[PDB]
Ligand binder design. Structure first.
Ligand code: ZN
Lengths: 114, 122, 123, 207, 56
RNA sequence: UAGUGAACCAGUACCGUGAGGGAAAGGUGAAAAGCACCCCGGAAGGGGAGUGAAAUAGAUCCUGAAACCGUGUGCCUACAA
RNA sequence: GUAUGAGUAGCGAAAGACAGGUGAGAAUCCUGUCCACCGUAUGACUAAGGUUUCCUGGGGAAGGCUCGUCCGCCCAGGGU
RNA sequence: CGUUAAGGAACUCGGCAAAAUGACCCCGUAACUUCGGGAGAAGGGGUGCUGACUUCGGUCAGCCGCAGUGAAUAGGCCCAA
RNA sequence: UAGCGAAAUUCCUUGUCGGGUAAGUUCCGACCCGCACGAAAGGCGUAACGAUUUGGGCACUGUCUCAACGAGAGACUCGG
RNA sequence: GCACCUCGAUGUCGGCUCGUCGCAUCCUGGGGCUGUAGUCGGUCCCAAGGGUUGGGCUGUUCGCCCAUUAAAGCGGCACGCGAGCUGGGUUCAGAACGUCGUGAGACAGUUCGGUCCCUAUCCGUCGCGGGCGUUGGAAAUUUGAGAGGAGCUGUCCUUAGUACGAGAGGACCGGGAUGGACUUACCGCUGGUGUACCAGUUGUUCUGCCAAGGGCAUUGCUGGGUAGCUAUGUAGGGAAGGGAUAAACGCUGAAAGCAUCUAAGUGUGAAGCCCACCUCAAGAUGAGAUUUCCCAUUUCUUUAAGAAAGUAAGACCCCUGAGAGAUGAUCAGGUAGAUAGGUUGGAAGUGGAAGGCUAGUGAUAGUUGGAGCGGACCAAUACUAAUCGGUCGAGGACUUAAC
């Protein structure tokens, strides 16, 4: 902790907005397909954080064509362009694993305009 | 983490729904498998009609396990089901359509005729 | 930690011994019980410095309710109840003291079991 | 050749310059006093005694100070050697800074493992269980001691005895950063050692 | 199992060379000069660091 | 350990619902003169002083073997199947 | 009669802690405080069966699977 | 004794042992037959708190949690010989 | 004789064909060439019933692939 | 086959755990011949270094069958292994069918059910301490006599559609990339556990009551989770080379004017032998080597390698402990101090404390406020405890040679 948090004040990212688990997020990736560079778009619900400094991570859930797909990103990658906070929701849990065995209209979150 | 006697699904127009594994081809005692591997299998349920019936030794390929893959970036994928697509050893599917999303890592192993038929390559 | 007994029995043991020394200020017990009583008593005197409602309403764990200690009357029979003693006497005693409110002294082995015995005091 | 001892701090992650996560150990050093030079005419060797830390001067003896006094430094904890280095280039009292491993990147790492006490015959050697049900009584035991005819037990039928506490190299690791102002080498991978222990870091052998 | 033989008189004694009682540190006091345990409250003296401790 | 099962408070104690089965256990000295009194200890137990020809005859009391358990010391013993 | 095994196995399902007594001696006896366990029973009354274990005051050689100033144990009185 | 990623009888002589069902109320319930049964067959739905109105049972509106017989006790089922 | 029949009976035998399984000497349906079924030491169907024996599905799962961690008693150190 | 051996009792088959040895070799490796064009092959010689799979069917051995793979070897070890496990099988007392017997019963004919006792003394094997020696007493560092470990292998690209062949097909020797099984360490990522951490919630009882809380119900149940320990997670390993050989092939050359790998002389030649890689290692009584530290009283037994007592360099006892631990050991410290507890701050983690206000008829909702709490984790701080002490521990033999 003394040397480590001196050695890694440098590769951090300061471009990251504030978001609680349970907030809909767009994530721009960076995809290498041979020589191309696409920028995809993911939209889900934040479920995790792994609070550790250098290596914090967070999760996203699509439900696309019946199957739900989950992808966990670390924070401080350079291979993520932006993170777009979209909504804000009533949550009371830090980790929302109970979503998962729910389908559609019994897995909705509310909206607080904040 | 797919082994002997584990039930997949079919994502084709080839008249099968579920499948048991038989073997996990390639090696001399391989335990498990991940996305992008080849399975010897049988057909244990079927919609009526269709080309592929029960009781057939059928090869297939795993798409979208419930424990996906590390990438060299540092991101992971975790799907929700287990599915597969039937292959004629040319890495060419028997059926026409494919339902549901599909992981990217089929492109690393020349499954281009499958990938270009998926609704989505994740 | 130091396991001594089962899970809830240690809570019973330490509520027993640390609601003592609030009343008597000397205790004769074994070695290891004294070390657990070090930690828990000194964690429960720092609540005696605050004097809030959270000082009271976190002293609802390690204080036995109906326990008296009287050196007291004006023309009455008026009773301190061993938590009032924390929030009226031991707080202002160590109002200027930092940590380290205790002493542990090594006397003798017990005759029955050859368990070495120990005195706890405050100042 | 290139040899530097040092501490062991922890485990981190470092993005590379193409954006890839890599696990990284954190190994310190200090300036590093050469204590003796051993030659063929005196010891039949070619080797160099090195030493890494600063003790208090309460915590040593007069003969330790008589070793240190030919280099005019503080008395130190750890003292080791290094064999098979073309010497020159070395006097009694030099310092071997962290700068020797810029991008040498092919490095053997040695330490000492953790310590785990008495454990069962599974957790050392990976011998499997017996059946936990269908009425058996043979859950977690070390097998049969051998045949009948030789009327003894052959040597090396391995059994329960203490886990860990011997020194283990790991070959062919890379080096990522060298922080000269903070004396830190960063290495890909994993190193046998508990925290604060010694680690020897050498240039590798197998080219 | 079952012991195969009587162990002789020699191997009674060759075991018991590690069946001793030994006595650890015995300092002498300040206030009485009497032989008492290190780091312990001197019982007949009642003192430790020259203080009436066992009193109060 | 013989001689009745039993020289001694024996067909007793003990065992089986019952008919029935059934043990072990002798000896201070001539005389009790069976240790007043002092000393340590809660006592038990011992050490003096006495009784007695003799107390290593002190009430488990004549002589007191062997296995077994200890103390002290002349000689040997840590490259040995 | 005495060894070896060996000062090994075992000490027969459970929650205690402190202060003050008495005493040559105390985790184990008495007193106080709080905590804990059962409560169609670990509570109350009785039929057999046992045959003085009951009450009062003293004692610690043996019994009590350790200790014991205590007891359903020993001494002495007395109650149906 | 308690918990477990992914897979879910591959273990094994044999699903032995564990796991899963379990309370009340409502819908619904086959072959077969000695017509009494099978039948709690199978398979499903509801349960907390507050207010209003209750013919009576209840009905409507609202609030909260992942989970409302929120703990303990309380049947696994089907096909054939 | 009727009625059954590789059977709680069949050595040859894993008889032959069909079904069930990716693969079934165990199981079910059929054939008769019954070593050696058979009518009160009863023959052949059978609803209900069975801590009965045997074959197969669903749900479930540390039984398993392949183990890991936690709690208590023993085990280990000191006193009796 | 025989009946030496065991009847005051020497327990069968398979399966599980664990292996080890032989080679008459299953794969990988080196070769000779071919009725070997090429890829495939057949036979024989060398070679034991490693490896040699999961399932269905009866109790199975044996065997049949599915799906794989470089290959799915044969044998010995009381047909290895029950004071290590199982007891299904065959060999108890119950009961039934077929057959035999007048009968009680019987059948290497079948069918259901049916008890596997042991607290390890000696050798043995795994780990770990005490004592002594190593010729004055000490603190460190270390060559290696010897021993143990590891030793396997597939697929694709490229030489190249090349040499070979009518086509059909399709290489050797080389170079590169990437897996399987196995195995050595670690907790940064993904996950598990996490019973003195956080929250929700039912029943009853207690703190006089409302509010706030404690006990008990498997930790009451349910949703998360730090350190630590962990794999299905991560990272790495078997590389490249050298010397003497095996089968096989030569060069030179005669005995035998020729011929001929051998007698003289002189080479090539394998996953195998000895090195090379990793570890243990001077109790290697042949007890090794280097660096640095330490310098003398009494009586005589008469000076012998005599006894005895204080010391030095140094070590131990005792105490606070964990990166260590069954106990002892190892290692961090002992007021020349950060070794542990506490205190002041942080962090992971949980997810918005109490109290008051506002809105609601209420159940509740909003704000003060990323709030309150915080077991092991990270800095700082002598406040408490490592007080005062004591014990042990050298005064260095002889012979010869060299200066
Ligand atoms: Zn004193």
């Amino acid at each position: 902790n003394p040397l480590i948090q001196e050695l890694t004040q440098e590769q951090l990212r300061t471009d990251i907005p504030a978001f609680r688990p349970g907030d809909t997020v767009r994530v721009h990736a960076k995809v290498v397909e041979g020589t191309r560079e696409r920028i995809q778009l993911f939209e889900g619900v934040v479920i995790k954080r792994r609070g550790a400094g250098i290596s914090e991570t967070y999760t996203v859930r699509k439900v696309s064509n019946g199957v739900g797909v989950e992808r966990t990103f670390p924070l401080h990658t350079p291979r993520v362009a932006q993170i777009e906070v979209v909504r804000y929701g009533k949550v009371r849990r830090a980790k929302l694993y109970y979503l998962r065995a729910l389908h559609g209209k019994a897995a909705r979150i509310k909206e607080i305009r904040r | 983490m797919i082994q002997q006697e584990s039930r997949l699904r079919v994502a084709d127009n080839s008249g099968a729904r579920e499948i048991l594994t038989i073997k996990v081809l390639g090696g001399s005692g391989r335990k498990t498998a991940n996305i992008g591997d080849v399975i010897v299998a049988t057909v244990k349920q079927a919609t009526p009609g269709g080309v592929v019936k029960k009781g057939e030794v059928v090869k297939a390929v795993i798409v979208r396990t419930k424990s996906g893959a590390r990438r060299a970036d540092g991101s992971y994928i975790k799907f929700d089901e287990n599915a597969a697509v039937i292959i004629r050893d040319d890495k060419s599917p028997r059926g026409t359509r494919i339902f549901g999303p599909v992981a990217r890592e089929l492109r690393e192993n020349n499954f281009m005729k499958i990938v270009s038929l998926a609704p989505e390559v994740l | 930690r130091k396991l001594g007994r089962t899970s809830s029995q240690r809570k019973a043991m330490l509520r027993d011994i640390t609601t003592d020394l609030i009343i008597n200020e000397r205790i004769v017990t074994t070695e290891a019980r004294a070390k657990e009583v070090r930690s828990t008593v000194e964690k429960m005197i720092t609540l005696g410095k605050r004097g809030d409602l959270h000082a009271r309403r976190q002293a609802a764990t390690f204080v036995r309710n109906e326990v008296a200690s009287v050196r007291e009357e004006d023309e009455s029979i008026v009773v301190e109840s061993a938590l009032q003693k924390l929030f009226n006497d031991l707080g202002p005693r160590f109002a200027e003291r930092q940590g380290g409110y205790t002493r542990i002294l090594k006397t003798e082995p017990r005759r029955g079991d050859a368990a070495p015995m120990v005195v706890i005091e405050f100042v | 050749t290139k040899g530097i001892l040092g501490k062991k701090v922890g485990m981190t992650q470092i993005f590379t310059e193409s954006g890839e996560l890599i696990p990284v150990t954190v190994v310190e050093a200090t300036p590093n006093v050469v204590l003796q030079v051993k030659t063929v005419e005196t010891d039949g060797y070619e080797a160099i005694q090195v030493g890494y830390q600063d003790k208090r001067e309460v915590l040593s003896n007069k003969p330790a100070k008589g070793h240190v006094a030919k280099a005019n430094t503080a008395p130190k904890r750890f003292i080791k050697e290094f064999k098979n280095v073309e010497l020159g280039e070395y006097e009694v009292g030099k310092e071997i800074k962290v700068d020797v491993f810029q991008a040498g990147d092919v490095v053997d790492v040695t330490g000492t493992t953790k310590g785990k006490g008495f454990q069962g015959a599974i957790k050392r050697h990976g011998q499997s269980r017996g059946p936990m049900s269908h009425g058996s009584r043979y859950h977690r035991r070390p097998g049969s001691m051998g045949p009948v005819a030789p009327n003894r037990v052959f040597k090396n039928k391995r059994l329960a005895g203490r886990m860990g506490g011997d020194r283990v190299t790991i070959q062919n690791l890379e080096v990522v950063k060298v922080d000269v102002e903070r004396n830190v080498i960063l290495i890909k991978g994993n190193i046998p050692g508990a925290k604060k222990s010694l680690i020897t870091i050498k240039s590798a052998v197998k080219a | 199992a079952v012991p195969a033989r009587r162990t002789s008189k020699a191997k009674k004694a060759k075991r018991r060379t590690h069946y001793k009682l030994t006595i650890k540190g015995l300092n002498a006091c300040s206030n009485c000069g009497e032989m008492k345990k290190s780091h312990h409250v001197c019982p007949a003296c009642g003192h430790y660091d020259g203080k009436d401790v066992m009193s109060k």
